[model samples]
Target chain A: SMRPALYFCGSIRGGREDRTLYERIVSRLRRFGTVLTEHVAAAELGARGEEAAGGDRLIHEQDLEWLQQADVVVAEVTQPSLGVGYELGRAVAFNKRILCLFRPQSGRVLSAMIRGAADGSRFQVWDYEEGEVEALLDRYFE
Target chain B: SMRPALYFCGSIRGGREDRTLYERIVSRLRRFGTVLTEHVAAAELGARGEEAAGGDRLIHEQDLEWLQQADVVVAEVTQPSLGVGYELGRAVAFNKRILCLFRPQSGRVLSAMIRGAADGSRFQVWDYEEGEVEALLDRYFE
Candidate 1:
């Protein structure tokens, strides 16, 4: 049915606990469209700390290629991330539809740069608690 | 009365939208703590994004000093950000309190490593729409 493609992003290792939620989200999202997990080797990134010097250029390039092929990008926007926000901003510039989700308990807030790039109207923000997100997902996905 | 400390990061210049968001998050977080915001150097990193062999070496030692002094660390765990995740991991190793926020709409799901780091608990998620964030903050303040 040519389901719209979605680029899923979340911390893998750095925010390992959230991995379960991401796994659940990705697994369910598959029904709507294609899901490319592992935005930034979060686990490895976390493990490396600052000593790693941002290694693994190949993966970054490969992920960028995927962004080029996507229709809409869904990001788990919390955490003060530089790379994720960078990718999100790029997706917006590419004119892709963006759906951003923030957790209810995450004290983390969105950066202004990301907000300006996606703008308020173009980017849809959702807070999922007790399954309200299931209701909103219907609007963005097929 | 300790002034809340703020820390900011994302890809150096990250994606332009991300830079905007980092700016916003930094401004907002000031209410919570004294934040250190580094939106990468858009002119430098943004220009460098087109070239290979860039990143990792962008930030300096002085920057690291500010990061080390932070009382609490908040990160945006959305994309495959090596730099951002490194900071989060280091903050934890330094024995500092940590919080990670993620946007669920993104395709890349949070990895198991990050979840496991939370001592068998899940890293909090925020879709950003719930009005109850203030209540959560109240608890954190307590």
Candidate 2:
């Protein structure tokens, strides 16, 4: 299989509560492509008082740079994060294949912006159960 | 009535179909305080490829500064925009009073991040009808 570059986005500040879920998703995503933001799944990051090495400005620039390099953008949006939302918008604008995975059981409402964009062709949004993450990815990535 | 400094958030690139709604809401918001981002309602600003002056970095800084100075924030979220979502998240973080108004008729679902933050204290979210925005703001701002 030809490895595709993937950008994985999760809530760093707004929804760090779902970091565990993000970590699991990132691990599974590694089988398909290089997950550029594997650090987002780290427990030490994505929480209050958890500082990044380069700070917000540098982090923003780096993330955008990665998004530019990626062939696909996969985001876990169950936790609402503005950063993730912006990434999604930028990914769509850049014409990359976009997939936003959210856990409906989290009981958080998915933003209409993300949900409304899911035409299942270029942009895909899925509300999946715990173990269904891998299956869902296969449907899209395979 | 003491005029409060109010920050108004809307989509510049995500969804411009609701620009008229933002304008109308801004019109009503002005009766209560200064609308810090009246330019957001401008007709020429909401579409893609129409770049904001000084780019996204400067814009993000300026918006955060305005949010810091403002006593309250009123966002029109009927059309989902990532920038607006980030501003909403920042507003909540700054401990500012926030009111997010959405027109359900637009068929956009509000993010759980915003809805979940409403505890009837510092943050509030309202789903409104076409003619009801003024009344809703009156109930809160008055």
Candidate 3:
């Protein structure tokens, strides 16, 4: 792939507890490809953050367009968001290369749909701890 | 649109709080089309649903097939399920005429993707009460 366009997926209102991890993941993903929709890792979309264009409908349109343009879709599914799930669904249909990262929490289990999609068919789900993302992406990007 | 094949989407482990509603919705949806996966409303898939053919990967495969076969996709989104969200995402990509129903709970806000999908390009979301589903389906099925 010549400069793959990577779409980074994460949470917004599903709690930003993983914001730091998302930032690190996006940073690492950027090395192998262009991490499209990286604003998800920024603090601007959070409460008290600076407002920007593409509020809802525009954001939805632009993200779907980005997903359309992407050669690969990488998502952090530890924090569940309908948007991420939606994008993953679109990725499967778009037949894009998908890598989903999940950090197992004490009381949480990954969704069957997300996990089940990892039976390989252009989709893979990886279990990662905080510092494991870099190595995991290395294995994938290689 | 002749005898539309409808795929009814609902919850599994997302707390079947709306199972009854799902049953009602599926039953009503059947009048307008063939609900390909009406089993979503059946109690057979619950704790003692007693061994279905498809477990995880099998389910993922079968549901995608059903979604592929669908002429119209109707989903009950009041109860959040990653699976349902995933299916809805696929439905949009499949270009199926979609109708999603939501019962506005007191403190719960719908996802931006689901609610935002109502710009109405082969997609529509409706807010309904217990008795309102009948009329809501009537409007869409018309």
lDDT digits (tens) for residues B23-112 of candidate 2? 888899889889888874573542222332324444555666787889888887666556677566556556788887867676444444
lDDT of 3 by residue, B1-142 (tens): 5788889987664456777778888888888888888864454654323223336676677778989899888888766566777888988888888888777652345566676666765788777777778887898878
User: Candidate 3's residue-wise lDDT over A77-139, tens digit each?
Assistant: 876566677889988889888989888652356666787777664798878787677988898
lDDT of 1 by residue, A20-128 (tens): 6666666667778877653443444454442255333444556667876887777776554444554664565467787877664754333334432334556665666
Which regions of candidate 2 deviate over 4 angstroms?
Answer: A1-83, A86-142, B43-54
What residue pairs clash in candidate 3, if any at all? B44-B49
Each model's lDDT comes to: 0.54, 0.69, 0.75
The A-chain TM-scores of all the candidates are: 0.75, 0.87, 0.88
lDDT tens string, model 2, A99-122? Answer: 888777875445445665567778
TM-score of chain A of 3: 0.88
Score candidate 1 by lDDT. 0.54
Instruction: Give TM-scores for every candidate, taking all chains together and pairing residue i with residue i.
Output: 0.45, 0.53, 0.82
Clash-forming residue pairs, model 2: none
